[PDB]
Design a protein around this ligand. Sequence first.
Ligand SMILES: CC1=C(O)/C(=C\N=C(/Cc2ccccc2)C(=O)O)C(COP(=O)(O)O)=CN1
Ligand SMILES: CC1=C(O)/C(=C\N=C(/Cc2ccccc2)C(=O)O)C(COP(=O)(O)O)=CN1
Ligand SMILES: Cc1ncc(COP(=O)(O)O)c(/C=N/[C@@H](Cc2ccccc2)C(=O)O)c1O
Ligand SMILES: Cc1ncc(COP(=O)(O)O)c(/C=N/[C@@H](Cc2ccccc2)C(=O)O)c1O
Ligand SMILES: [K+]
Ligand SMILES: [K+]
Ligand SMILES: [K+]
Ligand SMILES: [K+]
Lengths: 452, 455, 455, 452
Amino acid sequence: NYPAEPFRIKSVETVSMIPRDERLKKMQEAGYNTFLLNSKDIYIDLLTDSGTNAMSDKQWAGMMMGDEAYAGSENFYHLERTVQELFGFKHIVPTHQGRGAENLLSQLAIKPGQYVAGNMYFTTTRYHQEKNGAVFVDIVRDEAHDAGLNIAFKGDIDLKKLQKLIDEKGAENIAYICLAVTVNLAGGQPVSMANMRAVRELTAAHGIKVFYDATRCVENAYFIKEQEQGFENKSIAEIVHEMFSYADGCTMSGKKDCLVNIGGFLCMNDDEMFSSAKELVVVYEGMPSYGGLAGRDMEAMAIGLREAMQYEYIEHRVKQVRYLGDKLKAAGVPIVEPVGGHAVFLDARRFCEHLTQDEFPAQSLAASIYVETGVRSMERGIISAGRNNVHHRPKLETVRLTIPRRVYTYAHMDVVADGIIKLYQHKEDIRGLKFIYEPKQLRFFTARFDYI
Amino acid sequence: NYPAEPFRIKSVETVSMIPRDERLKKMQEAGYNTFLLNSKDIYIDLLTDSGTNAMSDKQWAGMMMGDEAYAGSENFYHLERTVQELFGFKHIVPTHQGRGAENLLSQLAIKPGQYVAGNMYFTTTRYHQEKNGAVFVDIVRDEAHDAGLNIAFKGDIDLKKLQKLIDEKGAENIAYICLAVTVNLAGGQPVSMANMRAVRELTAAHGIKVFYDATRCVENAYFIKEQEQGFENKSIAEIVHEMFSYADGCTMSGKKDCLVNIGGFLCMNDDEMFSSAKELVVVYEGMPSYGGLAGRDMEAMAIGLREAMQYEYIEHRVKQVRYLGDKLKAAGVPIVEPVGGHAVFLDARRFCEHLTQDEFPAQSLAASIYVETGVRSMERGIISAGRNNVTGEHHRPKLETVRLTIPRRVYTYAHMDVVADGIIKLYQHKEDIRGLKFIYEPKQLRFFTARFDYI
Amino acid sequence: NYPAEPFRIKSVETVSMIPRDERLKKMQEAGYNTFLLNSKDIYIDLLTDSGTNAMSDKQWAGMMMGDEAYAGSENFYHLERTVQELFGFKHIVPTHQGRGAENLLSQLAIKPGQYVAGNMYFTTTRYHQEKNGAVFVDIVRDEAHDAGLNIAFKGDIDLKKLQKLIDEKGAENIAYICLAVTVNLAGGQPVSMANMRAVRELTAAHGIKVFYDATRCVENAYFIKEQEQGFENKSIAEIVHEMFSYADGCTMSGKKDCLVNIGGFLCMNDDEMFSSAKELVVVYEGMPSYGGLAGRDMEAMAIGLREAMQYEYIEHRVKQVRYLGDKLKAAGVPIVEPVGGHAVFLDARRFCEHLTQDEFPAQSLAASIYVETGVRSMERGIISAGRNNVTGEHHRPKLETVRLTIPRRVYTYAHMDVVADGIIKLYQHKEDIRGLKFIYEPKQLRFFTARFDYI
Amino acid sequence: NYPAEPFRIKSVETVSMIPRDERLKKMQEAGYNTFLLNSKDIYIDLLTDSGTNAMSDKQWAGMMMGDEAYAGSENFYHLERTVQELFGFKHIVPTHQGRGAENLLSQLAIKPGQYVAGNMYFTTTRYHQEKNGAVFVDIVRDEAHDAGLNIAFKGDIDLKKLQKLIDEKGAENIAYICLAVTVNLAGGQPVSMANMRAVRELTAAHGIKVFYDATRCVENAYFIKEQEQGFENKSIAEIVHEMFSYADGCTMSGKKDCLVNIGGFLCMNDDEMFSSAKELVVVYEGMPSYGGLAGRDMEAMAIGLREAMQYEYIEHRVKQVRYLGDKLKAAGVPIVEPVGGHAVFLDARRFCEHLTQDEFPAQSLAASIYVETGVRSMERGIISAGRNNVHHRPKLETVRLTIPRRVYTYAHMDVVADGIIKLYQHKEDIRGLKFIYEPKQLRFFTARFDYI
Ligand SMILES: CC1=C(O)/C(=C\N=C(/Cc2ccccc2)C(=O)O)C(COP(=O)(O)O)=CN1
Ligand SMILES: CC1=C(O)/C(=C\N=C(/Cc2ccccc2)C(=O)O)C(COP(=O)(O)O)=CN1
Ligand SMILES: Cc1ncc(COP(=O)(O)O)c(/C=N/[C@@H](Cc2ccccc2)C(=O)O)c1O
Ligand SMILES: Cc1ncc(COP(=O)(O)O)c(/C=N/[C@@H](Cc2ccccc2)C(=O)O)c1O
Ligand SMILES: [K+]
Ligand SMILES: [K+]
Ligand SMILES: [K+]
Ligand SMILES: [K+]
């Protein structure tokens, strides 16, 4: 039901084990904002799965083989051929991480006033689209916004919505479709191959380009192998390769499914766009031959992307997340369903119905969770959705327990679940928050609170 | 209760995950001898807790700071200060691992014909004692030889036996007392502080030296903290320091409780013996300032011994082993009791009570465990006992066991479940396990390269 | 005098050692464009001193201690304290390297139509200034444009030009002064402390901000210690701290003087600009607590910046480059003078005075150097200048040079001899060097992938 | 004439650069014994080439791939096949370093009262021979004991002496011939292939076994390629393999020519001796499958032994030593000739003729050299030769400047030479030593002196 880790522990990261009374003072020193906690005071850090992964012995051997040459590095060639083989795109440009690739794509592929349509959006991706003049259009199925609705492949694009956008706006005014795998904001929900194929067919008939946000494509491939009829006999690598065969290019944060702590890249099949991409990468990232990465990190990412294709690794990755979700759900703790590939999302408005929204139940729930167990989590609701000129009220008001790859055990998942549940058994005791410091911008990062 | 890992995974070691049918072929190519399996074919390797530990990020940082100088390495001085602080001995000599320290001690402290008495024995330790002319005497409590008896501090020396030896042989004819912590041969059983003090008191009244085999002294310290009344407010480091205050020196395999993959050392308080040890170490190991270790490894061992003093680390280490024993015992699987600090020992005589010992039930059980789970375990039964080469008969040990030896910080509870679930499943059909026979038996060291086939 | 390396080799990087005939084939397969050679085919790679440095054992120990947390990493706090101590700025934001910091600064500090004035320019720096609407003005001393003039502190800003700009355009229309240390385009020439103070004094009287391009500020500090009277009793760290006391902030490529393979940062004293920078860094680089770097790299950069303050290290760094220039100059080989902190620039116009600039003498000289020695160098001449795409004509730079760029702590004087001996041998038969012509020219970034063949 | 380093610097070992006045106090704190100096106070440490080498990036990648299994390690199999391929012996037993292999060989191959004959001897090797009851006989050519005599292949065995030993003692009373390559005590002097072939032919005709001390066999192979007629077209690896084809087994300290910081092994062709070796290694070293080494060190040594076969590496290794020797000899500094593979040996009785032997000119010369430059060196004369029951007066009274592999540059060699020469230009100023502390045993290690 829940497989054991398909690897051994090679080396350990020492943690402190400071007790509850001391954690309380550390939380109070952070003004009750988990973003202000220091890493040295954290037992289990579930802020994000981005860049927090444990590398393997083979990756660390590659780390000693960094060819740091400015051009012509063996590490660059290894990453290049690995991505060409596993993803099937003609051209690759490394970037220091995913939002560097998004910066390049959005400048290369958007004319001001055009539309970018996607299955929901991610913060940085949509910023770079809009900064370059695009209008974002959400074409995900309506169900993906219903947090409790347990349906498969919730990340799928609604073809009816895409058709409507083409009819109302015209194909020439659509810069591209942005298809993300998995869909982070919906809870890490996967996209079916049938949907990628149908989106490809409809866009190609109109000459519209498709670019993937590939950041968790291996988790997505696992959901396809597990749940999409006809893929039970296909390897993860076969599934990944077919996925990208329905795309014109992709942006990738290697910090996610390539099992590294830094790294990303931009892929594309078009030669002229590749030429333009090489001119632009020099401005922001570095020469096309390293893209703002040390040689040893191009090497680690090449090795990690291939490790991620191992069935047992990605099965265990996803089922470990699922174990945390299953234990919370069996206790009645309200969560986004179905559990996604990389995180369990608490529904904090359901958790703290005794507190009003304006008392910040997600922030105070995250604070309570650290004090009782030593775990940090992130905000994924109104605050992240931004404010609107004419707030950006989201249906998904979530607190994220984000699982780094290969870092934690099921016993760590139990510490997390036991603490969230023991809190949930006295849920009414948790206390609302009020600001005592709020900056104008990026407030989730440095704002400070106190109890009402 | 079983605590969560008081650490995170910093990096992982790749494993193959081959399925049962392919494990059966690897087991057959190994002649059904788990000692012959390739490491790359093993998912969970419980052959030994020696030298198989996972180091920390701080140790690996130390590995980048190896001062490889032949004499005067900063890493030696760090190892020296650390052992002087944590164990309290005056002098320390590094050795490449534990049996190199034993070689030195036995040459330094034994005159031929003298007796060495200990709480049971370990093979390398006793060999070096006997090779240098000592006669071994077991002075452990009789309870330690009852593998089913669930009692605390089973490793304790019987003071009456030690008193008896002093009276019959004479104090001047006893080279030293060899007190091991924990006691490996009894299943990893701890020694109480009460016992260490009484032994120190009795030997000191007669001028007799006491040297500890300190290889799992931190596991031992945890049992004292957990179970000896009056130690509940003492830190692991306090307990360790007090333990060694009752010895004249020690031999240590860092490969066990110092959380490293190689390394050991010899400690002593006597200045004259220290001079002689420095003269001998150059013969077998290296200079007194590196003792057959790279500078980076003295550094890793210095850091790891200090890491081992963290209460939550050693609590979890010992309770992870206990989890494995508890789950087996709850399904009725026969094991040595109580569970020791580092391993669970299956009682293969009872597990395979349809087989005779001449059909090698421990060897066969270990083969079955690997086939069913990808877990390697060690035969510790008639095969490892060897054959009497005077008579040609097997040595027939009372203990016919399979050792599930747990490396420190390498595995999780889910790995422990893989081990337990597969053993419990084997146990539910234990009568189906077949006997083995030799098809190749070397003259010596037969457990290492012997090959078998099913009867 | 040329000091010995004030370090030992801890580990080496394997190289192939292919002979001349096989180097000729690799050069031909690269289309005679050294930017196209494979790193594995190069013995001594002098393409750039950026990101190619050798780290120390202490830095590699830091690499094992990467706290990879998304926010609040211990490595960030270490980098923060270190830069606050050594540079003296109030606020620091990591960026993945120097041009990421430049992107942020130019967006934060420039209103469209304003002027940015500097001591010459660097390509990425000036691009981000112009992309955000600034007009660039060169206020370096006229001497810096005379490549043969052997004078000290050639990088100094002409205070009269800065005064002239303030009077003609108005102080409110100057976004900031961009003072680079050293000045790359003049050959790596240093700026005097006297000049930094005078610039600070003049700009402060008008409310004008000053930001340093601090990429080789430690090389710059060494020239001040060596050649500016009154600094002979000052430590490198004292000089560095005083330099930055005359700026409102800086952009830094750690890939140069912080002795790392990746990393950079943005510094400033202004609280309001710091808030805005924290809002912008999330757009392009990452959180203010990692800025597009792994935790291990913030750690390595923190350790390396502090290592760079050691006098003997930077003395040897700069004198190793000087050794290369001196040996070339003594054989009559034409170079930019005086030699800068990080590179020797061959004057390929004069070296190949039998070729026209349209025959690409720098590109060809660099191809010849690799064939004869296995040394890679960078074309910094008409090819890198690019083609005017409005008119189709080459951009024709006054400087037609080959850059021998020296990575820090990677090479020895014997490697410098390989470079010099081969160049001197080429020079003794310089008339034999052939012109090149395009056989493939990309529309943009032509120095990176253009291919050539001999005329 | 002197090639540049055939590698780049990947990482540096930080040193202090403390000046002369501070070095003087550190030397005085060491009682004027370089063995008592702390490594952190040393710029250039030339005490020994044993275990002090710089590893490569590929070796450090292998260090991250340590398979620490007690039996069946991939690292063991790699070392095993590498040694079988490069040395050609049937069986290999790892040991933690060379004297662990000597302990095994001497117990396996010596009956009490038998003779072991060799081309000179080394300290640990001869101790293990004699401890197991053998009588040592030196059968090196007489010239090898003449330090100033510049002749090629000074390490060669005198076949006339070997013949005499067989005739006087009888073949059955000779346990084995111990042939070392190079010969350390003679100054690192090489042995010719012609001599290894002739020793093999004579011993085999009498049934006498030959075991090599292989510790610097790659340096030896370089001397053969450079100087022995007919080997100029042979690769280093071809030469090494032919060398060991004239032996029944060998002891190897990997700490020397295998380019590692720890490690060694015992090789042999005989099956019964291998079986006996496996039983004995368990007592002293570890199981035959790791022999007292971590897996990662078996890996590093397998990689390093193959790196040592690169012609340009070993040419530069030897010529760097030769450069130091040439610069001293051009200044009139008296040295052992010809310069050997691993060290330059000062002749300190010729250097300090104004001081008597009993004033310890070698010790005080080593002290002076550290104070003026930051360099440590070792004693190789009477003190190392031991005392005799009925001193062991040696013709070779040498101070060794021992060069670790891949650690230092020619500029470091110049610091060393310039300091020894500037001393030699005022040689008469150096001051004799007297004991202020002398232990009974191992006195070179901890004894303390003062100036007369
Ligand atoms: C689907 C998807 C992502 O999840 C993604 C990064 N995720 C992140 C990191 C992050 C970014 C912004 C605010 C908070 C946290 C996550 O914590 O979820 C990026 C950017 O990649 P980058 O971080 O490598 O620039 C692109 N697409
Ligand atoms: C020819 C030869 C060697 O040189 C050798 C080691 N040399 C050493 C190390 C050493 C040993 C004893 C006293 C002083 C220094 C050297 O400094 O010269 C060994 C022992 O190997 P080991 O050190 O690996 O045990 C065997 N044969
Ligand atoms: C109580 C005690 N005292 C001394 C030592 C020696 O230390 P060292 O020389 O190994 O460092 C050991 C180590 N025991 C290992 C390794 C082993 C040894 C022989 C056969 C199989 C396995 C095991 O129990 O597996 C020990 O447990
Ligand atoms: C004075 C000065 N200011 C800023 C930067 C940017 O720093 P960063 O973004 O590289 O970290 C640099 C780095 N210069 C490199 C790299 C390079 C860049 C373009 C073409 C070729 C090579 C070179 O001189 O080789 C610099 O020298
Ligand atoms: K990270
Ligand atoms: K090991
Ligand atoms: K780099
Ligand atoms: K060493």
